[model samples]
Target chain A: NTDALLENNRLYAGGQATHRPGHPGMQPIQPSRRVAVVACMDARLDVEDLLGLQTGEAHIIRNAGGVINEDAIRCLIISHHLLNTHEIILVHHTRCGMLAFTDDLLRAGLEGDAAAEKLIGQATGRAFVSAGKASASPAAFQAFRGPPEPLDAPRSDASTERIAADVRRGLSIILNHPWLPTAGPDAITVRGFIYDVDTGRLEEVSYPGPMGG
Target chain B: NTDALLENNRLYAGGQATHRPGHPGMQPIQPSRRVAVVACMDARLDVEDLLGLQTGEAHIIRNAGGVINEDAIRCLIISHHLLNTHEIILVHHTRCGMLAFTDDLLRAGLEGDAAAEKLIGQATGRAFVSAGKASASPAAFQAFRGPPEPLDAPRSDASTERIAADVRRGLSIILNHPWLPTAGPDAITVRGFIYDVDTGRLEEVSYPGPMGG
Candidate 1:
């Protein structure tokens, strides 16, 4: 599989007359579009193609759940402050693996591995995992799901709700961040979107409230 | 730009016959290729087109530097443990913004902002920052540069050396991670690559060692 991928890259590499010649060093260090996108690492979400982004256009930061966390915040800090990107787009998509299971489900899979269990707890959140092991986990991950009532609905609606909620979560994190600079020349405009995998379309996700919580 | 982008996406949505038929909910939650890729978020090195990866084929985790961090570790854990991906690819590209400057360069840009300065230190690393106001930073981000001798060389060579070094850094982190499971039924094969933006090709990054540090 690895060999095939390299060969594929080789084939693709040969077709790059259009990819080069604009800026030989792959455009400038700063994103030409001055935007940053946060999206799920789901194979379905081809951030560049779906968003109509060209190389040197924007910064794309992704992860397992596409949820905002301290690490994502770290990247966003460097992205805006250090690299000069100004917009933040948080994208969560339909049929995401994040909606499939909770942290406890993963823990149960680990079962008897105590050290692994402890690590999961620690990794998820210091306070999320308890000795009682009573509450649900994903402590940090599943938290991206926001609340339970919507998840009880049909899968599609639940997925949409999760996307909107996470967009708000990202807005709150970036806009409210003490160091991120959400005002004046350095301020950023943040929005969220849900990409429908069944159809290759992206719809804007609006959170009805103050920009950030 | 986003308004234009949304309009562009509307155009892209109609031309998706090939993207939709194979997987409605965007294939299964698992990556069909059983792989996950960690790459820098630079716009030029399109992961999908460059690697010939289709939707639902591989998990793509990206960030500003594409350097290994705790957050990326969390994604890889969920990716392999819950989603069944086995192979990992770490990709750092040529002319990357990561190679542009040090963490302190950014801190210096902030100048008199103490809160932002302290936040940068905390975000980069705990101990890398000091009260004496001495030493360099990237505390964590620029640590991906590995060592400094090569960074003093020609810009392109320094960038290449940095990419290889970061690949090793990623390999050491994932292979050495206790909970990531690098052996038995869940063993993983990790390879690193440097994408030549100047040439539009990926060259394998080789690290000589006993796998992990």
Candidate 2:
């Protein structure tokens, strides 16, 4: 299946020469708007098309749930401090895969110890015993933390809360970093939005600062 | 500046209804092609467009340098073991901001310690005298390990090597993990490529398996 995708890539590359040169060269390393987006890797959500951004407009960081994991924060700090992007936008979406499974379910389905050891040895040609130590606990793999819900239930509000929680988590990571900018009049602004996979609508899930101003 | 971008998003959403219904709904939790792409967050490089991928085709993971750190590995494992994606594509690009600066230079340019301390306090609101303990070491943040080059120097080959090295790093992480599938005819397949910012070209960097073969 993937081999076919690889072949398709070859065909695309054959015709890429004409379209490749049409875009101008040497775009600045810094984004034009100095804004960065943290969004889910959900295929249903197209970050650029939905946000109306051009090729050189913004940095887009993505992962499983678009959750603000440590690495996401690591990238954002580098994006802002090193590359001059300050505003952060986080976009999570409806009917996400993360909502469909739990860490326990995934761990239960993994191959047994013997199979795991054999697989690791085959992959690395290394001793199998040490490979066991390298396996992260199932808990470490949980990208999102929330109360479990029935898999087929419709819970749009819960999904919205999950997205908002992720945004808050990212905001906290940035605001707490020892070397990043402070949150104030000149502070970095962080906002969150939820993209509806069904309708392609983006709704603000949370806004920074005091309300009723 | 960001406010303008936000406004642009609003206008885009107003017209999004027309395009939203064109695509079908309820894609499976797993990627259709069972492939995942690790790529840079550069706005110029559209992973789907450049790779000839449709929505729901693959998992696209983006970060500062598209470098495979622990978190990237974490996501890939889940994508593979939990969601059934087994092939990995890593795409780094020329003229990346990561190639232009070192951690030391970035740390030196950060705001003063007092402000850092204050912001850390506000965000965490806990005893943060050990806030510096949370700081990742300067070396920990270097996504690329190659020797520095002048910002204006042409580095096509160097960029290609960096991309290859990143793919190798990801392969090692996957191979070493006891929980991941073993490398063989059935094991996960990994490949690397470099996207030319100037020409928008994607060229393969390295192939998997033993060199003699």
Candidate 3:
């Protein structure tokens, strides 16, 4: 619960003065390490714990699959051009929830269940993305056709390669963006890794290593 | 450097069995706490540390500004209907880099110096989003106009209010999505928080508390 989380925050905040003193995050807005890590929004994966990152060190952008899409590219542009980050790390893990995803399943799940929930109240008092006309909210569920695997199963070479291919795709997407800086000190460097859930370790792979001469 | 990060990870992985024993993340894919957090991709912000979340506790979806854009909405949809998370938390912090954003700056940055970098070559061997046509890559920098604030300055009431409004917008967007379950045991609960970078605490605000009874 947010209250429980708030209570925990209270304990953490209370010890700030006595423990870490000025706080490590009281630094420049630009990351000291000049990197951004794109990862999945999985509950089992903690990017900080695996990567040994501190605040003020790197930008961490995560989403459903940790896969690079148009939106991730948008953040990467901002992360580089505005925030001055240069390296991009794409992390996918074994037993990813996305591996279970199929558009057919999602379509059925969404369509079959408008009747179960009693229909929420009108949350639309303010009209932001609207005109005088009726416009249906657009939905884009990027689904992968894959069989769902058990979450705690042993990591496999095939799974690692599957996740690795996504990293390559993510890198290609970022590098192909015309807006991305290409050379000199500001050039973007990217890599991908697979994290094992059981062992809590990262195995790095990429289409190619780093960038520029 | 990623190499340095890898070294640290090596040490971390080396002692995993001796320390934690079988790793805390070797559990089910569904979050034990059934919550998903949407947050900004700030380097200084550590969601796990501040929220005191263990592995397999919550989904952490982060992006630039931590604001709810279309892609974030996409992720949240999957996080709920696919993964069974019920609570949503939006975390925007003090001294947001989005405040520094101006499309004019991004456009100028992108267009100004395409000639400077010597241009990396031959990265895109495989084409996924292509159809043998030279389509101009679309760019969407969702820039906000505001004077950039210092990263370590004391938190302000107005700043909190500005960040608070984003969370309200975020929650509204999530609730408005028709695919979302409304009034069942699976009803989604959402709240927003402001994280003070210095003190490392969360302050919750919402348009309304929880969902319909």
Candidate 4:
């Protein structure tokens, strides 16, 4: 069966097995520059045509909500120490699964426990606070309860500019750290972008470049 | 509850909040050198501590099997055009889920088809062939019954090295592409590593450094 599946891959891919030269190898020829991008796992995020990527132009990392967690940073260091990539991009998109519910709701859902109480709590709190009413006020019923947190969160009103700024900030932390070997006066670079889910378009969210004011 | 979770995170993390001053906000600092690393989603791989990463050292990309895909290239281009990372590291490990099950079995499992046959073709064939007499008469037992289609060839004993070499070769493809702006003279460099599950250690399978050889 294993052999059969491999045969299928070889046939479908034209005998070009993965990690094979003239096929799908890993470390192809070295590029002039090194770069990396971090993004969400949304099926709509087409990394190729959107970025005009030709075969092996860049290494893109995708995860839930595109949020930069510790695991991502760990890989970045390995890339620097071995692969020789120095640039990084962090992209988050709209209508992501990350925004659906709060962290508590997520944990509750996973455990299959009482998630409704917290859900109601959030809904009531939002309605009361936004309406300038006390928590005990009857007007608190106007609050909008969001859907239960699924496996993760979706996008939010967090301004695109702010998101980009946060990405830049993350880079600063890595660059300024004392223990990292590759980082110093001579190290890596970081940038940020925002992808529009509705139009399937990518716009430069933040950059210190030709257009930087 | 959301507030409580945030507070708990701070408490356990020693009063650290999600958006600290030098967090994921100020990134893409424009490095003088480039770095890259390829990693997998397996929870066991720890690129950070293994590489002694401080903060922003190199750009890291992740995928299902740490295999290079189309999306990786898109980010690679952006990294070259913007951040300046040029080196790469491809890392795969032992006991990988990818290596465990055949594609057919995986599909069956996903579809919840409990009664699906295991397709013991290879196992049965190998047993019969091995049971036959030594390398003498035309081994009838070794003869397969299926239509004579192109058979999928398995890798040789040195498959790991071959795989590592191929990874490097793949990186070269992106580096050599003419359409990509960064691939010209500033080609990217790539290496390979294998994580030994038994020892929880990373051994250099192949690299492009003086010490690597």
Better model by TM-score, 2 or 4? 2
Query: How many clashes show up in model 3?
Result: 3
Q: How much is the lDDT of residue A31 in candidate 4? A: 22
Writing each residue's lDDT as its tens digit, candidate 3 over B54-167 gives 568788999987877777877876777666688887888887766554544445435543321211111111111111122244345654334444433456775666666666
Q: Best DockQ goes to which candidate? A: 3
Cα lDDT computed for each candidate against the true fold: 0.61, 0.59, 0.60, 0.39
Chain A of candidate 4 gets a TM-score of: 0.58
Stretches > 4 Å off in candidate 2:
A1-26, A104-134, A137-139, A150-155, A182-186, A207-213, B1-26, B104-134, B137-139, B151-153, B182-186, B208-213
Local accuracy of candidate 4 as per-residue lDDT tens digits, B1-213: 122322433232242222111111112222223555556543334333233232234445565446554334543433343244566666665433333223333223223344422222231121111111122211111111122221122323343453354355445545444322333354555556664433444555543422201
A1-213: candidate 3 lDDT, tens digit per residue: 122222322333233111111235356667778788898998887675566555577888999879787678778877776666778878788878776555444554455433222111011111111111221332456543345444334667665565666667677777776666555545787767777676666666757643211
What docking tier does model 1 reach? incorrect
Error of 4 at A70 (Å): 1.5
Model 2 DockQ reads: 0.21
Clashing pairs in 3: A55-B44, A56-B43, A56-B44
What order do candidates take by TM-score, descending? 3, 2, 1, 4
Best by TM-score: 3
Residues A53-172 of candidate 4 have per-residue lDDT tens digits of: 322444555654455544355445333322346676666655443434444432232233445434533532321111111121111111012333322234445434344544555555
* Per-model TM against the reference: 0.71, 0.72, 0.73, 0.38
lDDT of 1 by residue, B78-171 (tens): 7876667888888787766666555654554354445545654444332122122331323345435433222112346656776677778788
Fill in the DockQ of model 3: 0.23
